[PDB]
């Protein structure tokens, strides 16, 4: 808030760490103690290219973001604003440092993730979303690129620029964000002005889409034409591939389906989602009592599991080199290796924006004369 001299004589900048549309992240060191941080330096003159109204609007937006982020401070999983410096030409926002980049790089390098890390990531995201909704604050900017990762697999939300308070009984009627993550309510409101609005709840669909992209490996909805993608999203006809979802439990699929519901009222809430059996765990208890039927059922279940484990082990198949000659995509290791090699070869053409996306790599459609029928 104060004079630039305080910053100048308190923090020593260092080499660059990242770049943005109009801001660059640089490392800084605290003198009175040598602690490392990140500083977001924002130019509010746009290098002298903006008209005064744009500068004023940018300053107002930055101030609103700062004052909204001030209240939420305290949660272990949110970015912490440590210090703030302001001048006529620059803002300096000092934050905790992370170490590694966002989830985009991790997903690109690993292609796809397993359920073990997905469980923890989803638990943390659901807890943060529940806290934010309890504080009557919405985000509307939940994207994989807006999550930071630490050395111990710790993720904290950031990029609260689009967040805004919602007074009770109100209904927002604004359209923002990437088209792929836009809920049906936003599109309906944009097309028709009679829609009441959308709500704290439009922040579930984004979580469901993030889960689907993390698991399957490609976004549920995507197409080369914006109109076709919007129409498909409106229809709501998400489908699971044949040789893609044959090695996943039914609970995960049920949870994903519950998350993505066209009707806003039927959509699962954070508290309801956290109660799903997928997150069920036990530590200790000794108050399990039931009738003889319960004991019989438990013994039968134990015996059945003991019998079934051996059969499940035996259900494996050999390399089947003839099978490889016939069709190599059936085997899981072959598909994994092919995907990894393809991503490594063509991994420099995946970037932010609708023009380029991960779904552009995989081609599950049967390229043939069927491609003639595209749309009306």
């Amino acid at each position: 808030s104060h004079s630039a001299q305080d910053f100048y004589e308190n923090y020593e900048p260092k080499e660059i760490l990242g770049r943005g549309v109009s801001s660059v992240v640089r490392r800084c060191i605290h003198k009175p103690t040598s602690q490392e941080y990140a500083v977001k330096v924002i130019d509010v003159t746009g290098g002298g290219s903006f008209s005064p109204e744009e500068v004023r609007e940018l300053r107002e937006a930055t101030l609103k973001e700062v004052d909204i982020l001030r209240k939420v401070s305290g949660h272990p999983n949110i970015i912490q604003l440590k210090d703030t410096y302001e001048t006529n030409t620059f803002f300096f926002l000092v934050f905790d440092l992370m170490k590694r980049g966002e989830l985009f790089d991790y997903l690109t390098e690993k292609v796809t993730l397993s359920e073990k890390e997905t469980r923890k990531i989803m638990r943390a995201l659901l807890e943060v979303i529940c806290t934010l909704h309890k504080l009557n604050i919405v985000h509307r900017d939940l994207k994989p690129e807006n999550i930071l990762l630490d050395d111990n697999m710790n993720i904290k939300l950031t990029d609260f620029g689009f967040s805004c308070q919602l007074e009770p009984g109100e209904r927002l009627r604004e359209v923002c964000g990437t088209p792929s993550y836009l809920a049906p309510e936003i599109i309906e409101c944009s097309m028709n002005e009679d829609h009441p609005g959308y709500g704290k709840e439009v922040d579930m669909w984004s979580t469901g889409v993030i889960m689907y992209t993390l698991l399957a490996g490609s976004p549920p909805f995507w197409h080369r034409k914006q109109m076709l993608m919007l129409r498909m999203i409106m229809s709501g006809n998400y489908q699971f591939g044949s040789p893609e979802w044959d090695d996943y439990s039914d609970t995960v699929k049920d949870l994903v389906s519950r998350f993505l519901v066209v009707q806003p009222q039927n959509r699962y809430t954070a508290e309801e989602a956290l109660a799903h059996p997928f997150f069920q765990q036990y530590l200790v208890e000794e108050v399990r009592h039931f009738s003889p039927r319960g004991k019989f059922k438990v013994i039968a279940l134990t015996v059945l599991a003991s019998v079934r484990i051996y059969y499940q082990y035996r259900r494996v198949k050999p390399v089947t080199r003839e099978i490889v000659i016939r069709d190599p995509y059936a085997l899981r290791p072959l598909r994994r290796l092919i995907d990894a090699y393809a991503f490594r070869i063509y991994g420099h053409w995946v970037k932010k924006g609708q023009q380029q996306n991960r779904a552009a790599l995989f081609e599950n459609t049967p390229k043939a004369v069927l491609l003639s029928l595209a749309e009306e």
């Binding site: 039914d250 609970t251 049920d254 059996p277 039927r293 319960g294 059922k297 013994i299 134990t302 082990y313």
Partner: protein, 144 residues
């Protein structure tokens, strides 16, 4: 969609499977349970089973993995084979019927400290025809 009773039953079964409460099945415990019924899988077989069940090479089984395994819908043919194997385990004697003595012996082998009156009450409640034996239809219906 499961229920509270189903979750409690699954937790009780998992606790029974793990003789020493540690939070993991453990290869030694798995081998002990396998040998209790009269099976002797080799160490390589146990390692292969653990690797197949687990999603990584940690070599341990947690509660979520057990819940996922026990929540699968096995259809009919595989379910029929599993139920036949379970009956054969319970049908060690070549008679095709379940008696109180057989159930008591099975519980004792599994490590259950029950009483004769308790087993008699359990068999009486389970039985429908009142002949003291359980048929295939009753066993299949009670499986759910």
């Amino acid at each position: 969609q499961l229920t509270e009773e189903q979750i409690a039953e699954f937790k009780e079964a998992f606790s029974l499977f793990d003789k020493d409460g540690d939070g993991t099945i453990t290869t030694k415990e798995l081998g002990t349970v396998m040998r209790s019924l009269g099976q002797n899988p080799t160490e390589a077989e146990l390692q292969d089973m653990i690797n197949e069940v687990d999603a990584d090479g940690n070599g341990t089984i947690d509660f979520p993995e057990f819940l996922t395994m026990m929540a699968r819908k096995m259809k009919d043919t595989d379910s029929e084979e599993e139920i036949r194997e379970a009956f054969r385990v319970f049908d060690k004697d070549g008679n095709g019927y379940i008696s109180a003595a057989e159930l008591r012996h099975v519980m004792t082998n599994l490590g259950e400290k029950l009483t004769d009156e308790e087993v008699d009450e359990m068999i009486r409640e389970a039985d429908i025809d009142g002949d003291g034996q359980v048929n295939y239809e009753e066993f299949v219906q009670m499986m759910t």
